[PDB]
Design a protein around this ligand. Structure first.
Ligand SMILES: [Zn+2]
Ligand SMILES: [Zn+2]
Ligand SMILES: [Zn+2]
Lengths: 148, 295, 83, 107, 98, 224
């Protein structure tokens, strides 16, 4: 591979480097092999990244797997959408995947657990005859008695 | 409903789920529901102080409840109650009832594993109260004894006491609405083969639940105020007003017929087994009542 | 649980959502023969009227902004910068 | 901290939480042959003093449970010896602001 | 097609149109009104409107009380839940006792 | 499934992005507090190029007759040759360009210079040039201090977060770092005079616009 690196006079140049690429993955152990650069080793298995290098390095792997998918088709999506997703996947500290009367089953559980429904969802608000505290509902409007 | 209310007007920002203790149900009742009938004082086709108007609702046009007045129309519905001769299970929670049972010592009320144990310390740690129950249940459903004394973390030559008791634990199966207990000594050596099977009365289960420490039932997902584990066993049963009913009365009738005759037997002195069988029809009609209110 | 007029830390700019909701709450009122505060230099369209109102800064309403922790700031229409 | 060459025994390892307050950490050697906090995807994690923590929570007005998490046995948390309830401030490079700080609380 | 399903709602959420989403997804099921204890969120409040007397028998309270409007279906859904020994408590306030 | 997973996340009036529990997902949306509609691909100039070339384009040395600002660039030009105390400001602006370039080459290890940022500065400058009919053929009436201090003061007003404490201040500064690098690179003294040839008035227009546009790119609370 070609690697853009700054040159002695400051400008970026290409400098090829050999790179190995493997079928299969043993990160903890291959990292440790003499002669490699352990600081730049990579895998497309973001689980292994999180297991060896931690939640943040996994978060940043995961983004880079997501971004590869979307660019390999040739399209472009702004950072922050994929960043949102990948934060949602890693904010508990591991990698969490994103993938008249019924339902009763669930309300019984609510009961017995003392479930507190925050009432911020649009369905819950429908059932109650209300607007959801989203967008145009995320503030109240009141009559301005303080004015002339 | 075009009439006026001095009560300030607001939207609902929070829904807090739980269960109705028997105290709070007696607490916000009007009527004690005891006779199971509509109308005809002897033979007067009009209104009875026993079910139907005993202070809750009204068809009648009459702008009348219990000085609450308003139209057969801007009346919420008020809430009735019916004290139950014996406790019965809530049908909806038989399977919860069963798994608490499996977590807790069926003499003392004390959780079967605790801080000392360590796989349990990690389940104890979990955050989500439904994953946590799940996890502690997995550790405890195995545990056949209420231990006295248990290795510590530390220098395990030595043991350390925990609040004890020592009693062996049933394997519990489900058999309709009946939970069934099965005790050993061992897994088939010398000492004791043949288990002793024995039904779990609601009565003993309610009684074990009332004995489980706040710490220990919180730990299972329950909450001191809003849902304690006892409250999955009914004692006191809410009667909805006529706004709820469009033939659910025809069914609460039947609950009372059963409540009336379990009490007339328990009064008369009456054999062990009749008392139990009338207890089981109570239960079935209180179960059917709600597994019907899924509608 | 309220946050004194000084020390308020949220944007002084009106958001698209507030603006949308203001204009529409006010057009609802103008559409039900509610008195108006501005010169109708012809307009018959209640949204349009409301927008004239918002531009002349004659909409007497207050935006209560809740912060995630229950606490809130009150910002008047008069004061919010409209961009 | 105790670094060992290939294992401990089921019941050695039981001697660890054992003398509170003083804590005890174990590492296999192999997990140390390489410094994982030198790797490019691993950003700078910095443990906050409990004051720092107080401040962080007051200024965002959060509960502890609203903060993002890092587990006790995350590699970096092991590396920094964090304890539950401790908060690391993570400062990362970012292609939209250059720098960005996030925080996670140990579980 | 000719509907307004999950995906159409999601686009309206994306644009932030909460009023639309409430109008479209309502019942014409009329807004029933209801008094509510502010301590036990339940619809137990005895409302004498003519003598102006409002009591929670049981909460022992005639001060803390509220009016709310909800669809009739919901006032039923809740009393159905009370029939099953489930408390669906409605509170007017988010951040609590603390 | 993605929509069901993410559907409750909203920006709040603290600029934080959170779920229906109030958990924090991000301490500021997108790490920069912007709306993606108001962001455009711009080149960050400090990053590329040789070291010689970056020092011709940005270095002003008032104490050196080869490396000062020619006097046809600027009215004050005669009068600032050899002035020691302007030179102190200008050394300070250069040291910040230098750090800028190092910082960014750590962020963009590759050297990629073109990255989406809010406020298309090139097109504001192009407008100022049209709008004030600007002669490439007259020295400007801008001073050194007008530029150097005007560009420092604008930075303080590119606000995303508004809290009075230190923590929120640090957040605010981190949020606005990359845009400030592009800013100091684009309105450095020698570019302003030698390339853009701004007058004082156009310069003052450049800034106050940068600032309105920046403020209008910030994301709005309530967005889903
Ligand atoms: Zn009534
Ligand atoms: Zn026991
Ligand atoms: Zn009450």
């Amino acid at each position: 591979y070609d690697r853009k690196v700054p040159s002695p006079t400051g400008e970026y140049v290409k400098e090829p480097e050999w790179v190995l690429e493997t079928d299969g993955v043993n990160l903890s152990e291959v990292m440790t092999v003499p002669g490699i650069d352990p600081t730049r080793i990579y895998t497309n298995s973001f689980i292994d990244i999180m297991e060896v290098l931690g939640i943040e390095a996994g978060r940043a792997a995961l983004y880079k797997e997501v971004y590869n998918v979307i660019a390999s088709d040739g399209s472009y999506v702004n950072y922050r959408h994929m960043a949102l997703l990948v934060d949602v996947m890693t904010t508990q500290g591991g990698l969490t995947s994103v993938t008249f009367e019924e339902t009763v089953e669930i309300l019984f559980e609510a009961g017995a657990s003392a479930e507190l429904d925050d009432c911020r969802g649009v369905s819950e608000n429908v059932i109650l005859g209300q607007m959801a505290p989203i967008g145009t509902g995320a503030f109240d409007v009141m009559i301005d008695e303080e004015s002339l | 409903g075009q009439q006026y209310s001095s009560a300030p007007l607001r939207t609902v920002k929070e829904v807090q789920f739980g269960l109705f203790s028997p105290e709070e149900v007696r607490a916000i009742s009007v009527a004690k529901i005891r006779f199971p009938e509509t109308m005809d004082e002897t033979q007067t086709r009009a209104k009875i102080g026993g079910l139907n108007d005993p202070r809750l609702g009204s068809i009648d046009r009459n702008l009348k409840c219990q000085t609450c007045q308003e139209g057969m129309n801007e009346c919420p519905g008020h809430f009735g109650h019916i004290d139950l001769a014996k406790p019965v299970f809530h049908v909806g929670f038989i399977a919860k009832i069963k798994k608490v049972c499996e977590c807790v010592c069926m003499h003392c009320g004390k959780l079967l594993l605790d801080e000392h144990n360590e796989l349990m310390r990690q389940a104890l740690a979990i955050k989500d109260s439904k994953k946590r129950f799940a996890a502690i249940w997995t550790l405890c459903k195995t545990k056949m004894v209420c231990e006295t004394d248990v290795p510590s973390e530390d220098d395990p030559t030595q043991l350390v006491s925990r609040g004890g008791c020592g009693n062996t634990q049933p394997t519990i199966r489900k058999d309709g609405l009946k939970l069934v207990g099965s005790w050993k000594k061992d897994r088939a050596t010398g000492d004791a083969d043949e288990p002793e099977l024995r039904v779990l009365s609601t009565e003993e289960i309610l009684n074990i639940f009332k004995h489980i420490s706040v710490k220990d039932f919180t730990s299972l997902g329950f909450n001191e105020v809003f849902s304690r584990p006892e409250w999955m066993i009914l004692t006191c049963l809410p009667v909805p007003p006529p706004p709820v009913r469009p033939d659910l009365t025809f069914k609460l009738a039947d609950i009372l017929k059963a409540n009336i005759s379990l009490e007339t037997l328990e009064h008369n002195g009456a054999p062990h087994h009749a008392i139990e069988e009338a207890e089981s029809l109570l239960q079935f009609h209180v179960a059917t009542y709600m597994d019907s209110i899924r509608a | 649980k309220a946050i004194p007029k000084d020390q308020r830390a949220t944007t002084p700019y009106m958001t698209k959502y507030e603006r949308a909701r203001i204009l529409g709450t006010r057009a609802l009122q103008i559409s039900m023969n509610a008195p108006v505060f501005v010169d109708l230099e012809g307009e018959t369209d209640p949204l349009r009227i409301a927008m004239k109102e918002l531009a002349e800064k004659k909409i007497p309403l207050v935006i209560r902004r809740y912060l995630p922790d229950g606490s809130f700031e009150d910002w008047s229409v008069e004061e919010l910068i409209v961009d | 901290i105790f670094v060992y060459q290939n294992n401990i025994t089921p019941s050695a390892m039981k001697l660890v939480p054992s003398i509170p307050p003083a804590t005890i950490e174990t590492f296999n050697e192999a997990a140390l042959v390489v410094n994982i906090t030198h790797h490019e995807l691993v950003p700078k994690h910095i443990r906050l003093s409990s004051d720092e923590k107080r401040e962080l929570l007051k200024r965002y007005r959060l509960k502890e449970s609203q903060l993002p998490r890092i587990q006790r046995a995350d590699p970096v948390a092991l590396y920094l010896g964090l304890k539950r309830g401790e908060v690391v401030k993570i400062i990362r490079k970012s292609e939209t602001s250059g720098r960005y700080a996030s925080y996670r609380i140990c579980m | 097609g000719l509907r307004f399903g999950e995906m159409e709602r999601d686009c309206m959420i994306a644009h932030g149109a909460a009023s639309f989403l409430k109008e479209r997804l309502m019942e014409a099921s009329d807004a029933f009104r209801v008094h509510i204890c502010g301590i036990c969120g339940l619809m137990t409040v005895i409302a004498k409107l003519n003598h102006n007397q409002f009591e929670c028998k049981g909460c022992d309270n005639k001060i803390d009380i509220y009016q709310i409007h909800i669809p009739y279906a919901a006032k039923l859904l809740f009393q159905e839940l009370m029939a099953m020994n489930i408390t669906p408590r409605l509170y007017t306030d988010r951040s609590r006792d603390f | 499934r993605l929509v069901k997973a993410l559907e409750d996340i909203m920006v709040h009036y603290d600029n934080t992005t959170r779920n229906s529990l109030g958990n924090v997902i991000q301490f500021i949306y997108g790490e920069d507090g912007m709306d993606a509609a108001h962001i455009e691909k711009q080149s960050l100039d400090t990053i590329g190029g040789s070291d010689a070339a970056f020092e011709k384009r940005y270095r002003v040395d008032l104490l050196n007759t080869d490396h000062t600002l020619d006097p046809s660039l600027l009215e004050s030009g005669s009068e600032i040759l050899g002035d020691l105390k302007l030179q102190v400001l200008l050394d300070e602006e250069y040291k910040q360009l230098v750090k800028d370039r190092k910082f960014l080459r750590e962020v963009f290890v590759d050297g990629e210079a073109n990255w989406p940022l809010p406020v298309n500065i090139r097109r504001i400058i192009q407008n100022a040039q049209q709008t004030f009919h600007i002669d490439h053929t007259k020295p400007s009436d801008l001073t050194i201090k007008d530029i150097v201090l005007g560009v420092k003061d604008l930075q303080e007003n590119l606000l995303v977060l508004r809290g009075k404490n230190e923590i929120i201040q640090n957040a605010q500064r981190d949020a606005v770092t990359l845009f400030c690098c592009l800013l100091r690179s684009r309105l450095a003294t020698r570019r302003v005079l030698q390339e853009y040839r701004l007058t004082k008035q156009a310069f003052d227009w450049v800034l106050s616009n940068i600032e309105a546009q920046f403020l209008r790119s910030v994301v709005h609370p309530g967005e889903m």
